[PDB]
Design a protein around this ligand. Sequence first.
Ligand code: LU
Length: 352
Amino acid sequence: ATDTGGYAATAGGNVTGAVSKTATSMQDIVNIIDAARLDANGKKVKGGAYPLVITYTGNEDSLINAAAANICGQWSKDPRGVEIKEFTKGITIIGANGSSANFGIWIKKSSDVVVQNMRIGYLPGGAKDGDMIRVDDSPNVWVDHNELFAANHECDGTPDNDTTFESAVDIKGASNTVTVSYNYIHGVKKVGLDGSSSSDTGRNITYHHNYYNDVNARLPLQRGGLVHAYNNLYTNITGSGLNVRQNGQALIENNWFEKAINPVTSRYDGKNFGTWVLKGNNITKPADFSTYSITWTADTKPYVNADSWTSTGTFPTVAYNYSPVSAQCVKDKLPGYAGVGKNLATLTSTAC
Ligand SMILES: [Lu+3]
């Protein structure tokens, strides 16, 4: 249904008149989407001819396992990904239990796209924007119950010394409403951006019930707009957490932070700091920093850290209806709902 627990209101391909197809490989996904653009007469239709619910049964563990053993050999390879360009009829790509992919999903100028239960990791082509998931000029996208991973490590001699692997979920352009939920993101250096440049500001993103572990930064690197981060489990953050920039507003509530450096900050621009409303997290005052191993660092440019752990601004009325569970409940239960193979389960107060 349209309820995603966030700003995105979409059902993807699970609508009336949808056609279900099974993909056993990346190639099939491409061929299926391509066929879905032709009407009864064999003519193409703008935005697609009919809704789709593609179930991916392929498994590329062999590619993933070989990449994991040769981390530094991935960045120079050709990037692999299925591009969903200008398809608006509605599309849901569900990975079948047991499936895995060594290719990304790149959404471009589309709408109502749902990506669920996909295990994507160690993609090749980091030097050529090999993102695991990319949302560009695409409103109403829902990235739910996926496992996005790689190795939180940078190899030597990589272009820009930042391209060993690319991001987990990059959002940019007119991707006005998006919900990123129940994802198990681990071992990723650059998790994902929310705005590709200082000029690419806006969008309303909801990050909830995501379990991040062993990640370096960008949770997200927010550029303007609104970001509602609730019920996320943030552990072992090696660089920085939510980086609220270009005057962005964030509502950080009922989250669990632990072993994290600069969990909530605004840095790198040296100006136009974003704001945050802090409520109901495991941390309530600076006295809890030592309790949960929270450390802060400075930046060479003017920056703002939430080292006082107090709200620095306001946040509009959260449009959608949601009910956050307690920070303690996410810490105790979230790991069992986030990720693939959980049958798209959701954490409720009744399970606390
Ligand atoms: Lu990218």
